[PDB]
Amino acid sequence: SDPEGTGGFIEPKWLAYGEIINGRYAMLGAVGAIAPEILGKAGLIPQETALPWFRTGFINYWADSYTLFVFEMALMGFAEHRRFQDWAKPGSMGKQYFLGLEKGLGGSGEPAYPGGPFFNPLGFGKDEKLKEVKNGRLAMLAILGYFVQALVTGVGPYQN
Amino acid sequence: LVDRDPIKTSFEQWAKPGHFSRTIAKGPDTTTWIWNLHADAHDFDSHTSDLEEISRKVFSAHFGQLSIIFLWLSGMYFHGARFSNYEAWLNDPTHIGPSAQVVWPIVGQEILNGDVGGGFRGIQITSGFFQIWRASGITSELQLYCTAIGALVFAGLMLFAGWFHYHKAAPKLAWFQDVESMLNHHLAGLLGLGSLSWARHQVHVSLPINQFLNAGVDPKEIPLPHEFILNRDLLAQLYPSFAEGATPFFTLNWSKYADFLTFRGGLDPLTGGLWLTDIAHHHLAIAILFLIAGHMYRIKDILEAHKGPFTGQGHKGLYEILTTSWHAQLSINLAMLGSLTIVVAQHMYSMPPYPYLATDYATQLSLFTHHMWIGGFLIVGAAAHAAIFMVRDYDPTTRYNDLLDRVLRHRDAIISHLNWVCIFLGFHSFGLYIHNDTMSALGRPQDMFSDTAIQLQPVFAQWIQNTHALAPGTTAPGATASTSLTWGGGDLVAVGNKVALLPIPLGTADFLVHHIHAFTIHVTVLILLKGVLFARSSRLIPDKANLGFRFPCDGPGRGGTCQVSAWDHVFLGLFWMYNSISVVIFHFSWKMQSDVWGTINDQGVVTHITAGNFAQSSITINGWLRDFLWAQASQVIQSYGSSLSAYGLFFLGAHFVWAFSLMFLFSGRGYWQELIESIVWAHNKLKVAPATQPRALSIVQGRAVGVTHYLLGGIATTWAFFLARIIAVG
Amino acid sequence: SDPESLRWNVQAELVHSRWAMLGAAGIFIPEFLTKLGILNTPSWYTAGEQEYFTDTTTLFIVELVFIGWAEGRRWADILNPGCVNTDPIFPNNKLTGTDVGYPGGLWFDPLGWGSASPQKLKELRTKEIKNGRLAMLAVMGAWFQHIYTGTGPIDNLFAAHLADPHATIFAAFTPK
Amino acid sequence: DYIGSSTNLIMVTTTTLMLFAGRFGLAPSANRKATAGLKLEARESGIQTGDPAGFTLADTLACGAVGHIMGVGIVLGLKNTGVL
Ligand code: CLA
Ligand SMILES: CC(=CC=C/C(C)=C/C=C/C=C(C)/C=C/C=C(C)/C=C/C1=C(C)CCCC1(C)C)/C=C/C1=C(C)CCCC1(C)C
Ligand SMILES: CC(=CC=C/C(C)=C/C=C/C=C(C)/C=C/C=C(C)/C=C/C1=C(C)CCCC1(C)C)/C=C/C1=C(C)CCCC1(C)C
Ligand SMILES: CC(=CC=C/C(C)=C/C=C/C=C(C)\C=C\C=C(C)\C=C\C1=C(C)CCCC1(C)C)/C=C/C1=C(C)CCCC1(C)C
């Protein structure tokens, strides 16, 4: 049958709750701070013809370049909509191998978190003494947002 | 209908004769219903007896206009791009004479394609892109080629919002049937946030990128595709980066400035398109309002309020049903939208807002008559649709005893006056001219009405024009010139190719056209006024809202009993307005060229396209084909074998099509029946006709194929007559 | 809410398919086959280098006298006898319909079990790779595109141009 | 900062007058026309105290109070007060 797409007060919000959750670790720059020593800046159009920003940043880059940028975001977007179909369910994913009884070996199950199950029961001594895990990382997202253009330039920190 | 209603078929209705009132298109065959179907296709007395949907259709099948205006414009930006002449023309204006369209040399074609400027074969333009396009804080041909697909973007999407309505299971009542906010929004931030947003991209980028164009260069020897960011360093030439001010207010010092704006009025010597150093300030100074303004409000309250003695008790209550009409809240609109378009048509020609207009003569009068026929074609409408109200829209009579029930109370009255108004005019408003003929052909000028024989004496001046160009000495601040250079007082020096605007003098031969307009504007309106007013009931027929606002004519009795109705008042009211506009046009160019347009050289001895021939000689209404129609038009009937030629070569058709209207306008109906059978007979002998009962035209269809033709005839006639006497000398 | 949307021949589109596609077989394996460096070389002197040309448009004539003949015979007795008038059985005919072809005439028929059944088993084979061939050739017919567009130098036509790195065309692989 | 810092404070002042001024002027609304200088509720004089605007307007005039002379014809005399 024809594919589905139910709107209803607030799908737009479940997938809109989700969009920012992904963007909260695609926040990247300060979540994984080792990520950019200077990688937040993409480094457009600075040909051995010419130039970057403008006075920039200039004492954008060496680089990790290239092409094959569309093929990625498309091809691995050709997976985002599969853990969205496959586990509609009727399970058989573990096609195993025709012969061989020696395949008890499992791996996990369906995972969310420390894995197959949680696992290794046995725990607490010290470590010690649903959306807040969402809310605070747009309070990390939209923050670099203005920090791209984060300048007064002609002048600077009035505050100071 | 009946078909499957239910619940029980996605299976769409493709196949089973008919739909549209109920002994419908009947099994039994006929033709009338094929003009039915297209006509009245949009309407509402059928589809359902229940509002609901309709507003759920009109907010959709609306949409596909924007999207369209949007597929359109694209093929115009594309067109105004790679079918170039814009690049070529801009380094080289005063010089060029622009194109966008070009044939392909199939059959006869090519004659139509005739050297236009930056070195190529094509057909010209009187549609002032290439001049909005001055704008381009950037320039580049492939660029417009982005603005272009940027267009097709808005479209497909601003056209899948129309899937994303009606066809999608729709909003409802409250959504519009709560009106409470609508203009709140609209005027505040778009009306505002455009004009506003337009400010930001109207000094940022445009001002500078023609601040130093108004001199020379060849583009990209100027205005990069990014260049205009943070770099507030070239914004250095065109005022401070605020230097020491912070977000206006006052603890500011000017020992030598006052931000961009520094208000102009007049006209760039080198590009008289009016100054831009202003154009930001005025759009800014708009938006604010809208920005403040769209912040009412929530409705009745304000109209539920001020009444009086004879005034409007029903003022109070002036329509619950103004959330429950459309046909009403469309007709109101058209009068404004419409009447608020031809107010363009002036402030344009006596105050150009684009670089290179006036000098560009033909590329802003086309305008001033295109814009001019909407500020009229939209007004008779703005009446029709009120008639459509006055007859039907509401369910019952819940609306009662008010401003209207009032106006109607008198009605053989408001239109009783207005009438005499017109014959007072007409006699003072046309036979006025006819004097002249009868007495200038008699010939005794002593006694004409000349700008010089009947007592008036070498001055017009002392009125209000002369207290306009001279007002920069009131509460007025100032700024060299006026507001509109065409005013009485001071100044001359305007432009170095040809001319632009200068005073524009008056008296008589300006006095009386100005009056024919009155009488023309008035008797137009009489017929629409009395038309929409007497919409539903009368003492020629009271049983007279009983079908719809059309209906052919009630019937041979009562004497006449034919025209009546109000489709038809909006049929003979078009008939006038075609004049209303068609003679106002006739006015402007005969002025604007008899005086104004003309030209400088040494000692700027001015040389109008015509040494004011107007003078003593429009006053004669023959002078109007001595000096007009037979004078100019000599360019239409010379126009063969050329490049424009498509005008002369239209000017025969369409000067034919009109003279085909009368046949549709002037004739019976069981006539072409009585005829259509003789035909139908000869048909049957060979065995070749009956199926789909061939039928003559639906009394009022017939009038539909009058009128519409009479106009698309009688009109493009001049659309040709014109473009052919501004292209080429003028 | 879902298109309405079609068919019915929904039954026939599928048999210029096995036409189009099986067919692309002919091009798919013979090309690449070609035979790299066979040993090598492609030289065809024979009827061809001296008798004043060989083909082109006597090419087609002879060439599709045959295709002529056979492509016709192909769909127009695929099957369908009954072969005229006059009320509906749909395809846009089956105005063969209820009669295959003949009431006890000849051996219209192939094969016992009063039908034409080329027996029951063989969904196998041609459901798979074959309406493959439909699919396959979609993408190495999308190679036809890649394989040559770019009109190897020898011509820029309508000069945008519009930038410049380096060339393109075919032989297998890719810089990447 | 700059003089614009004594103008940050100054922005604060325009903004403030207008808001402060504002609640009173919309407070006992549902009123429209009318007040005391017309039809029925007389206690006359002019009077005395009723605030928003007089007070704010008086303040804009004031703000030019202490920065006066210092910005103007810069410093003169030998201590205008006589005190050491
Ligand atoms: C905001 C405005 C706008 C809108 C949305 C509407 C909407 C409507 N009008 Mg309306 N109208 C308008 C402006 C508008 N009008 C104006 C300005 C006028 C004054 C002329 C009218 C005069 C008018 C009348 C008299 C009627 C309507 C009617 C209607 C309704 C019928 C619609 C229909 O079937 O299309 C009608 C369109 C066609 C059938 C297409 C034919 C168009 C022909 C004449 C071509 C025009 C010439 C052009 C040059 C030809 C193309 C080029 C060619 C040479 C290649 C509909 C609700 C009708 C009704 O009965 O109410 C329910 C009634 O007929 N209108
Ligand atoms: C300049 C260059 C380059 C390159 C390279 C390249 C470079 C290539 C390209 C390719 C391309 C592709 C593959 C595609 C693309 C597309 C695009 C880019 C687009 C974009 C856009 C925009 C911009 C916006 C809108 C959207 C779009 C998408 C349209 C070069 C340079 C140089 C120098 C210095 C010297 C010599 C050497 C070299 C080294 C050479
Ligand atoms: C979304 C937006 C926007 C905008 C802006 C806009 C939204 C603008 C607009 C404007 C509009 C305009 C500007 C209009 C125009 C019109 C036109 C141009 C038309 C014309 C014409 C006429 C005259 C009539 C008819 C015909 C034609 C059409 C031609 C934004 C938003 C936002 C947000 C939330 C976030 C943050 C940022 C912001 C920004 C704050
Ligand atoms: C004879 C004819 C034609 C004529 C024609 C004429 C003799 C005329 C016509 C006309 C048309 C028209 C005319 C249309 C149109 C149009 C247009 C496009 C318009 C536009 C415009 C506008 C926009 C608005 C207003 C203004 C104007 C008009 C400019 C034809 C005939 C024939 C024959 C033999 C047979 C077959 C068919 C044919 C081939 C067909």
Ligand SMILES: CC1=C(C/C=C(\C)CCC[C@H](C)CCC[C@@H](C)CCCC(C)C)C(=O)c2ccccc2C1=O
């Ligand atoms: C001339 C005239 C006619 C006769 C006009 C007719 C019959 C015009 C209708 C002719 C149709 C449009 C011809 C349609 C035939 C073609 C569409 C069929 C072939 C399809 C094409 C491929 C040609 C009237 O019916 C009439 C009615 C009321 C008042 C005045 C008049 C009036 O003046």
Ligand SMILES: OC[C@H]1O[C@](CO)(O[C@H]2O[C@H](CO)[C@@H](O)[C@H](O)[C@H]2O)[C@@H](O)[C@@H]1O
């Ligand atoms: O093995 C990955 C590769 O990338 C490393 C991780 O190993 O880290 C940076 O270097 C790559 C280039 O290889 C960047 O694209 C990557 O995204 C960076 O984090 C580097 O050490 C390795 O070369």
